[PDB]
Amino acid sequence: GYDRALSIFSPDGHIFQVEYALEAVKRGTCAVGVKGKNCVVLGCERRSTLKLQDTRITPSKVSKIDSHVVLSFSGLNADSRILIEKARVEAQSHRLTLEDPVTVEYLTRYVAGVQQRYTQSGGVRPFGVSTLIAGFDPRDDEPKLYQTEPSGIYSSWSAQTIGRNSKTVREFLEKNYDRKEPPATVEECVKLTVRSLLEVVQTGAKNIEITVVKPDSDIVALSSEEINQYVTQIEQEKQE
Amino acid sequence: QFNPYGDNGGTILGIAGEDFAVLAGDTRNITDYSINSRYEPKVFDCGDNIVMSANGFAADGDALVKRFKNSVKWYHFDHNDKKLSINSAARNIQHLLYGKRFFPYYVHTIIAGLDEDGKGAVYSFDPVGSYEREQCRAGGAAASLIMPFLDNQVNFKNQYEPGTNGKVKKPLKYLSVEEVIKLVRDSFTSATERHIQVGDGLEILIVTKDGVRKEFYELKRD
Amino acid sequence: NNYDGDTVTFSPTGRLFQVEYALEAIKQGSVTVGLRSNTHAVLVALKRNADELSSYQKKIIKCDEHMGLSLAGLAPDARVLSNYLRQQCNYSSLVFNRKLAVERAGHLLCDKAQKNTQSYGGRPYGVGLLIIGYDKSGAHLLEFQPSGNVTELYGTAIGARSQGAKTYLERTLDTFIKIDGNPDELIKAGVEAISQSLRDESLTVDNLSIAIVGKDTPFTIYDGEAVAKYI
Amino acid sequence: MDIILGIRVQDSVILASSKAVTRGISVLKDSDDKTRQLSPHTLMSFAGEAGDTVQFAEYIQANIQLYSIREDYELSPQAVSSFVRQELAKSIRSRRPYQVNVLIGGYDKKKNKPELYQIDYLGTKVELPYGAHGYSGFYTFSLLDHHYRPDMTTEEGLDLLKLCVQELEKRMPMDFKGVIVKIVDKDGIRQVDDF
Amino acid sequence: GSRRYDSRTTIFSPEGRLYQVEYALESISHAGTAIGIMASDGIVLAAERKVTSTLLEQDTSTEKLYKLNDKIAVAVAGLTADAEILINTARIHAQNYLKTYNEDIPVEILVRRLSDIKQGYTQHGGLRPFGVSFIYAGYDDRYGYQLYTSNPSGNYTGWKAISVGANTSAAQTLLQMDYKDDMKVDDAIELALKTLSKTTDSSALTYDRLEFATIRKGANDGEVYQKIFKPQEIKDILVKTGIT
Amino acid sequence: DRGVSTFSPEGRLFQVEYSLEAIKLGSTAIGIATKEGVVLGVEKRATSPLLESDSIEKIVEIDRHIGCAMSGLTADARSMIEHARTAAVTHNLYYDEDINVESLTQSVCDLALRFGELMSRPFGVALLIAGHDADDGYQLFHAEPSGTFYRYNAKAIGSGSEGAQAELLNEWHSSLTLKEAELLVLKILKQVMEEKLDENNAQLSCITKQDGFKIYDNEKTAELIKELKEKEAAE
Amino acid sequence: TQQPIVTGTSVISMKYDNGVIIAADNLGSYGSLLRFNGVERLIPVGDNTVVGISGDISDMQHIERLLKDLVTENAYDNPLADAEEALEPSYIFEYLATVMYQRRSKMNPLWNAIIVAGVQSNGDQFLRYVNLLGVTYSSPTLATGFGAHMANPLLRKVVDRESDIPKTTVQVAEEAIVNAMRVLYYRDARSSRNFSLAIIDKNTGLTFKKNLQVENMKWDFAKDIKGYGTQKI
Amino acid sequence: TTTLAFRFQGGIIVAVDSRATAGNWVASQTVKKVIEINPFLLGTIAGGAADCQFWETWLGSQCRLHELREKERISVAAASKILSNLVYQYKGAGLSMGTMICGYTRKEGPTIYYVDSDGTRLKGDIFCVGSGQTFAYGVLDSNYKWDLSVEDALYLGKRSILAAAHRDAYSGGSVNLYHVTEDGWIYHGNHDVGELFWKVKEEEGSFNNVIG
Numbered sequence A: 001g002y003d004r005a006l007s008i009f010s011p012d013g014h015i016f017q018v019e020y021a022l023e024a025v026k027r028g029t030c031a032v033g034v035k036g037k038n039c040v041v042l043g044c045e046r047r048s049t050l051k052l053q054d055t056r057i058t059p060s061k062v063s064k065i066d067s068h069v070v071l072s073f074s075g076l077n078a079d080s081r082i083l084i085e086k087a088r089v090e091a092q093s094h095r096l097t098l099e100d101p102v103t104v105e106y107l108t109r110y111v112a113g114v115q116q117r118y119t120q121s122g123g124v125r126p127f128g129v130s131t132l133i134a135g136f137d138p139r140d141d142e143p144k145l146y147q148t149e150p151s152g153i154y155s156s157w158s159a160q161t162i163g164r165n166s167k168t169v170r171e172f173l174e175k176n177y178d179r180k181e182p183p184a185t186v187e188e189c190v191k192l193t194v195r196s197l198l199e200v201v202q203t204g205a206k207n208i209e210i211t212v213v214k215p216d217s218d219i220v221a222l223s224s225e226e227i228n229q230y231v232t233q234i235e236q237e238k239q240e
Numbered sequence B: 001q002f003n004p005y006g007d008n009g010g011t012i013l014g015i016a017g018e019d020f021a022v023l024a025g026d027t028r029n030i031t032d033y034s035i036n037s038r039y040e041p042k043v044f045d046c047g048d049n050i051v052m053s054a055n056g057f058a059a060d061g062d063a064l065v066k067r068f069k070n071s072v073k074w075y076h077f078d079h080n081d082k083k084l085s086i087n088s089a090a091r092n093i094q095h096l097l098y099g100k101r102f103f104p105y106y107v108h109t110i111i112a113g114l115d116e117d118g119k120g121a122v123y124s125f126d127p128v129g130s131y132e133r134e135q136c137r138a139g140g141a142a143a144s145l146i147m148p149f150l151d152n153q154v155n156f157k158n159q160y161e162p163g164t165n166g167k168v169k170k171p172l173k174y175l176s177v178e179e180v181i182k183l184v185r186d187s188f189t190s191a192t193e194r195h196i197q198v199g200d201g202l203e204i205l206i207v208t209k210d211g212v213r214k215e216f217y218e219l220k221r222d
Numbered sequence C: 001n002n003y004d005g006d007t008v009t010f011s012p013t014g015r016l017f018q019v020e021y022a023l024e025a026i027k028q029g030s031v032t033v034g035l036r037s038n039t040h041a042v043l044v045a046l047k048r049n050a051d052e053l054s055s056y057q058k059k060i061i062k063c064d065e066h067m068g069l070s071l072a073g074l075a076p077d078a079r080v081l082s083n084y085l086r087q088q089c090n091y092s093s094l095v096f097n098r099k100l101a102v103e104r105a106g107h108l109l110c111d112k113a114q115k116n117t118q119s120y121g122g123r124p125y126g127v128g129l130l131i132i133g134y135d136k137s138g139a140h141l142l143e144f145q146p147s148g149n150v151t152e153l154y155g156t157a158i159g160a161r162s163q164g165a166k167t168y169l170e171r172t173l174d175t176f177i178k179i180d181g182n183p184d185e186l187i188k189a190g191v192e193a194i195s196q197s198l199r200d201e202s203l204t205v206d207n208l209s210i211a212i213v214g215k216d217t218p219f220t221i222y223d224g225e226a227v228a229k230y231i
Numbered sequence D: 001m002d003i004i005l006g007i008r009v010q011d012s013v014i015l016a017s018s019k020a021v022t023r024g025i026s027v028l029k030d031s032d033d034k035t036r037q038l039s040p041h042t043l044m045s046f047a048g049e050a051g052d053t054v055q056f057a058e059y060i061q062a063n064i065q066l067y068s069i070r071e072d073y074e075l076s077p078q079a080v081s082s083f084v085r086q087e088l089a090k091s092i093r094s095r096r097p098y099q100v101n102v103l104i105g106g107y108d109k110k111k112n113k114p115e116l117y118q119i120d121y122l123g124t125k126v127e128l129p130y131g132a133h134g135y136s137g138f139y140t141f142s143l144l145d146h147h148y149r150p151d152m153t154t155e156e157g158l159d160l161l162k163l164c165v166q167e168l169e170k171r172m173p174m175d176f177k178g179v180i181v182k183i184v185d186k187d188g189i190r191q192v193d194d195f
Numbered sequence E: 001g002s003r004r005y006d007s008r009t010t011i012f013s014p015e016g017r018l019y020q021v022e023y024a025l026e027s028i029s030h031a032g033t034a035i036g037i038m039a040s041d042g043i044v045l046a047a048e049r050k051v052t053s054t055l056l057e058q059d060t061s062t063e064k065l066y067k068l069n070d071k072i073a074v075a076v077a078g079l080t081a082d083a084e085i086l087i088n089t090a091r092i093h094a095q096n097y098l099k100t101y102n103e104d105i106p107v108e109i110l111v112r113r114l115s116d117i118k119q120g121y122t123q124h125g126g127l128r129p130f131g132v133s134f135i136y137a138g139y140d141d142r143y144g145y146q147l148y149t150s151n152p153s154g155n156y157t158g159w160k161a162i163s164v165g166a167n168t169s170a171a172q173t174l175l176q177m178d179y180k181d182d183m184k185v186d187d188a189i190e191l192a193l194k195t196l197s198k199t200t201d202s203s204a205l206t207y208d209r210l211e212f213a214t215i216r217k218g219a220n221d222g223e224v225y226q227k228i229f230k231p232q233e234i235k236d237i238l239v240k241t242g243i244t
Numbered sequence F: 001d002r003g004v005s006t007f008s009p010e011g012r013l014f015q016v017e018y019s020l021e022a023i024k025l026g027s028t029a030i031g032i033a034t035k036e037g038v039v040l041g042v043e044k045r046a047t048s049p050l051l052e053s054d055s056i057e058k059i060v061e062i063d064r065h066i067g068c069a070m071s072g073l074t075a076d077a078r079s080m081i082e083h084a085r086t087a088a089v090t091h092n093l094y095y096d097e098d099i100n101v102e103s104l105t106q107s108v109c110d111l112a113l114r115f116g117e118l119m120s121r122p123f124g125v126a127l128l129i130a131g132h133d134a135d136d137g138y139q140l141f142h143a144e145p146s147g148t149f150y151r152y153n154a155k156a157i158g159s160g161s162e163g164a165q166a167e168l169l170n171e172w173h174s175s176l177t178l179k180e181a182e183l184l185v186l187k188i189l190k191q192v193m194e195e196k197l198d199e200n201n202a203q204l205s206c207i208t209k210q211d212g213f214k215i216y217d218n219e220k221t222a223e224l225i226k227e228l229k230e231k232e233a234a235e
Numbered sequence G: 001t002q003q004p005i006v007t008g009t010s011v012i013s014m015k016y017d018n019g020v021i022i023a024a025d026n027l028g029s030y031g032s033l034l035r036f037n038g039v040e041r042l043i044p045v046g047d048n049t050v051v052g053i054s055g056d057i058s059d060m061q062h063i064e065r066l067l068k069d070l071v072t073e074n075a076y077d078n079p080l081a082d083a084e085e086a087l088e089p090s091y092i093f094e095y096l097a098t099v100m101y102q103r104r105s106k107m108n109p110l111w112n113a114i115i116v117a118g119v120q121s122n123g124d125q126f127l128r129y130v131n132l133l134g135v136t137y138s139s140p141t142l143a144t145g146f147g148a149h150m151a152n153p154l155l156r157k158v159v160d161r162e163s164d165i166p167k168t169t170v171q172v173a174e175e176a177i178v179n180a181m182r183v184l185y186y187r188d189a190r191s192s193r194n195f196s197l198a199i200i201d202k203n204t205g206l207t208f209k210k211n212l213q214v215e216n217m218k219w220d221f222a223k224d225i226k227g228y229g230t231q232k233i
Numbered sequence H: 001t002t003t004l005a006f007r008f009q010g011g012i013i014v015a016v017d018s019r020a021t022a023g024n025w026v027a028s029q030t031v032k033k034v035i036e037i038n039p040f041l042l043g044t045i046a047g048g049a050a051d052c053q054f055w056e057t058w059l060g061s062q063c064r065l066h067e068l069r070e071k072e073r074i075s076v077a078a079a080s081k082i083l084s085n086l087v088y089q090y091k092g093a094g095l096s097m098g099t100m101i102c103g104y105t106r107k108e109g110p111t112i113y114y115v116d117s118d119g120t121r122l123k124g125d126i127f128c129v130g131s132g133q134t135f136a137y138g139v140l141d142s143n144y145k146w147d148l149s150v151e152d153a154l155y156l157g158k159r160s161i162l163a164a165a166h167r168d169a170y171s172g173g174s175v176n177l178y179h180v181t182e183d184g185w186i187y188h189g190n191h192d193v194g195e196l197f198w199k200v201k202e203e204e205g206s207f208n209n210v211i212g
């Protein structure tokens, strides 16, 4: 078997392969996660240099890991499939042995553990992917939003963004998001998510994807017209 | 067809006192109707004030004691010369025995010593690792003869207080080392009379805080 | 230079630089002394600390009731090698009912260290060991180097400034060799020997580490207030 | 584990499964549900060797649920039954085979047709209008040969099922403590609480 | 040891790119152009053969267009030998799915698995990636007619009309111009050829330098037919559209 | 390039020495041992204010009688903690007793050098392992990726380690109470931390014989922070 | 799982004041067929140990090779191979005992019963038994097969316990062994007249005696015996 | 063995005998057949003594590792399923285990799970396991109601073991009582059959088959 230590330390104490994997994430299309009072919303960018696409069959950016948990990402698309598959298998394995679906923290911890393993295993490179994992624990109404990255570290976020120009949208969320009072309703949370993406995207046509997750396995993806209504509303209020 | 097990006979006996504990065993070793040895010890000092005997199939018995002795040695290396407590030794032995659950050591094991409060302790095992602390246990070929006698004389079973209309039980009390050795000697002479695989000699190992002392007594050689 | 990338490469002058760099890790290590008479063998080891708040790194390891060593260099490598010796000593006991000869103990360590210096991927051990023991041919003292070279000696020392103690023992050879049936006087000679390698610092109660094996003496280590006698 | 029945009617599939769990001379439980929902429109009942039954049912359940998540799509009853058969077909030539017999009742949403599959522990699959495993079949098949019609309603199917249970309660040696009945149709799976 | 000679095929650049994947794509950009166009009632696959020689046997040849099963086909761009390794794997995977579920494999599932194999070569194993880009053209009863592409990175995407290989930039602009959603197969056939005719590096587009295929529901009642065009059939369709 | 298990000319393993530099970049972690207990405290260091700081788990339970704080590439610590927990529980299963703190530390440190060309590189994280047993009492250990571990009366690791260690040198004595030690960790943490110390960006924990290993709540730590500020202003 | 083919019968032995004696006949039986008559079943290891082996001869020959190889291995890197670090009887026994038990534990035993007789470096008498099951035991007298049933009773009249060992001379001990071998020849159907005897003394060392014969046999009384009951002629 | 445990108004009662057998030989009269997994989980055991003892002690270790990893006490369902999945791997090898994992959690409430060595795992309100299970069932079923008091429930469990200890030749020694509430398990003492039988006979007026 191919054994080479690809991920290793450098004189200054850095693992360059993990850091270069972060650069791949920075290149990837923007992804945002905002959690409200009774919901979580996952916003995603889709680059508009690709026309003549078939949106029916093209892999969607947000992926269901189980009926109650979702995973979006930024970075290498091919790598993301491997993490999603493993996560989906672990989700069914957890239900089989514990007789209870995974918590969002547990699923995140597993995915992060896989990512970490590839930073100190021989013959493999790190995943060029950072994920946003969101959902609701079984029989619980408290919204959960977590982030992972190539190194393997993970943490919970009230709101967070990853990918290209993420530092711009993070700047937006940091002043606009109030800890004491998060988005009370679904509409308020989605609007804030779309607003944050509109700082970066370009046009609000077929460039923005939105997926709303609610308690008790209530997940739905918004259509073009539904998203376009938020874009139309925000721009009219902006001109002031 | 080849049969990997054999019966080497003999019998063993463990009794616990207040500040001491004894582990006795006859020195006879047999196969079928032949005597192999009139003096072949099977009660061993294993260090850390733990005495052990694994009676039944001697090859398995020696193998087990040898492995436990080695377990004690590596316990010192891996845990800064810490003394192996009798309760910890017992649990370790369970894993040794259960490790061969599907090809067992054909032995009834007994260990004796002092617990961490300085009080006498006897632990006893089945062939596959089941164990239990007791004041009293006989093991081996003549266990069925000796054990009920011990229930009567050590734990005062079926004995009531005279003139109380069988209402008040005889109170439990610790026995002196002198009284315990009397029961051991009588137990083995009685077992020697009625069991053909028991005889030749009796070797007792006594365990106090001071250390491990030995005592030997002759038994009938027929 | 170009021939020190790994242990599988010879230099143009026929040197193994990775083995030599492993040898260098020993010189950085704290000093330890070994010596023997005809009845007893003694290890004296100067323990090292990170700072005043830290503990003093334990240098001496027991291998069997009749054998043990002191270390100088990478401590984890000493743990690997000592563990191997513990198994080999133990194998000799269980299988042959025989205490392992100190000479065979050295031969086994030599052969284990050698395999690491001839194969790609692995590395040499980064530690030197002083093995003492009492077997069927009396008291013994060995010096192990991770090149594979093992040497039997009356006395020796390894580590930083070990030349001072080694010169003293070379002078004292005729005196301490005849300290028979006297443990305390043989230790005193060892404590005086290690003192020749001291600079600025002196031997304190939680700094010094002594071990002894002999005719009617199992391998035992002395630390703390037990070594206050010899200061 | 003993009695599992299945009846396919016009617009649904009805599965009846006994509630008794017996070991030795003791009925340990009289309310046992011998099915697992594989998907929203597919139900599998099971019977056979103790332990094997549930272990197999849940293993299949996990795999089908994994497929559903991956493709965001429900597998057809025919496809599920083929997957199950293959697993049992592998099993029979293993070191220790699953000794489990199953009935797979499902509603195909693309065809708008109910479907009932009978698969034994060897991996022997058959599509049937009515099915049974174990000794039950020796009574129910002939009974259904007589009383069954292909164009029956769900209510007619339940009466037809009541006729089977009555016969089994009369002539079977063992007390199987009645049955749990479940209906599979276009609207999914639901349990008949009063039977 | 051997470390000295290791190219390290599965590592990141400082910029966060996969060297070998990028260089494999550079290789594919010199390969003969392959175009896929999806219509409402079928799919077209067109591909240009790499500088044909006059003594090349044209009728009994297969370079670009391969059949994976009865419902799915692929157009190749890159190393043919590499593509054939992947194609046989894809053919086997399709038969495993049929054996397991007694149903023809859904197009995306086949595409994903083949793309996952390519992904593996970029993350582990220390081997070079497959220097191949596929255009998948297929049909199933869930999504109907589908066009996908995969590249050495193992990343795949769905398309209405797409090109791979050489001059994709020019080809994609022309497709984006003339393509519309209510298009028929016969119109898509014409678009595919017109696009190759303008993007080709050759002087003039001829029958002997082309491979062509369609996936229609043109068979009798609710069933799909794969037509790998013969040399004479390409000659006729080339005259019919008015290119020669 | 060059081998993973290569020695430098000075006699050190390159990869081990480079991993020590990674640990210096990590967040500060302090441990203090007393006769009344061992205290462990860490700097959380949230990279952004949107990050929910209570999800930052840099203090960890190994067993009821052993706790652990970390510093450096904290993702690497997950497998180390998993091993420690298994080692502790496995020893309880084999020997029907609590496992010695030193023996636990030694078991964790055996993983450290199991790397080469086993895992591909050393761990990029240092651990402070605090605990109690019947033999050697309250103990604090510093476990490095070199496979070496030292026992300490008090120890600081991370970015502000050399500054904090010098402060611990002066402040530590053998008669410290638990309450005094708690404040001393908070005092020294506030000195070396970039941002201002509060209950959300710093976490305390302790291990006592009676109550075992306990991570303090943000309400309990907040009062100790308020008690600390008042006592410094009082003279 | 084995069955023994070519087999060797009793090996008998005992302790005396200065050392140990061991003996075994020179027969290799093939069931009831007395096939091979020149078989040596006493194998010396060094000048201080003799291993007596009964049971399967093929396995005996395997054990011979193991002991032969053990002497070679002990000599490697050992300047004191013929002195302080020479092979002891206790070392040789424990090695065999380890092997015998390992082989039975793998259900593939060496179908033998072995007696290791010798004298230790400190002058102590060594005599211990081990067999196909890995069962070990020591006693003043040891015997295998029929020897256990017929020889031991006779040898125990000379040395009945530990305290009888200093009181037993080499002359008395050897006479008892030679007598036991005769009794075995009378009564064991798989025994031969020819045998080998070995004495390991702490003073005079190893004395190996070959080509001995059972003699002074009582057969004369046979002529008077007629029929099985009433027969007179 | 004879072991039982039943759910009722005031939580769960758990009662076991204390006899060990080696055929017709009485190996012990003082054996512990309730393993205390944690303050909220109990495990009864019946069958092979070593198998039971070894694997239920092992189960406790797995439950401890769960709460370390998940920062939360393991559910009764998950705990029972760890054990049932374990014995299922050994199916056919000859393990002999009849356990009843009894405990309380917030999400489940009071819960009992029967698990055995041939892989059967059942949730239920009443279970009796062991050689004398039928004798216990006879007394328990005929007197059981959901609305039993803690005092009456404790006694019924005790009286059911006593019944089996009497009739079953492979059960006896003494009765070990437990009571599981929302606050955890509570031990209700060891009761020697030597004294308990006559005490019950006299006070209750039962056991008229015996010579009084």
Ligand SMILES: *[C@@](C)(CO)[C@](*)(O)[C@H](Cc1ccccc1)NC(=O)[C@H](Cc1ccc(OC)cc1)NC(=O)[C@H](C)NC(=O)CN1CCOCC1
Binding pocket: B104, B126, B127, B128, B130, H001, H002, H019, H020, H021, H022, H023, H027, H031, H032, H033, H045, H046, H047, H048, H049, H050, H052, H053, H094, H095, H096, H130, H131, H170, H171
């Ligand atoms: C009653 C007494 C039924 O006999 C109980 O099930 C009791 C439960 C118990 C629980 C914990 C501690 C002790 C006892 N079980 C026994 O007493 C048990 C009965 C039994 C014996 C053998 C079996 O075969 C698998 C199954 C059940 N007794 C023992 O386990 C005795 C003490 N030990 C042996 O018989 C030793 N054998 C076990 C099987 O493997 C070979 C050695």
Ligand SMILES: [Mg+2]
Binding pocket: B221, B222
């Ligand atoms: Mg007799």
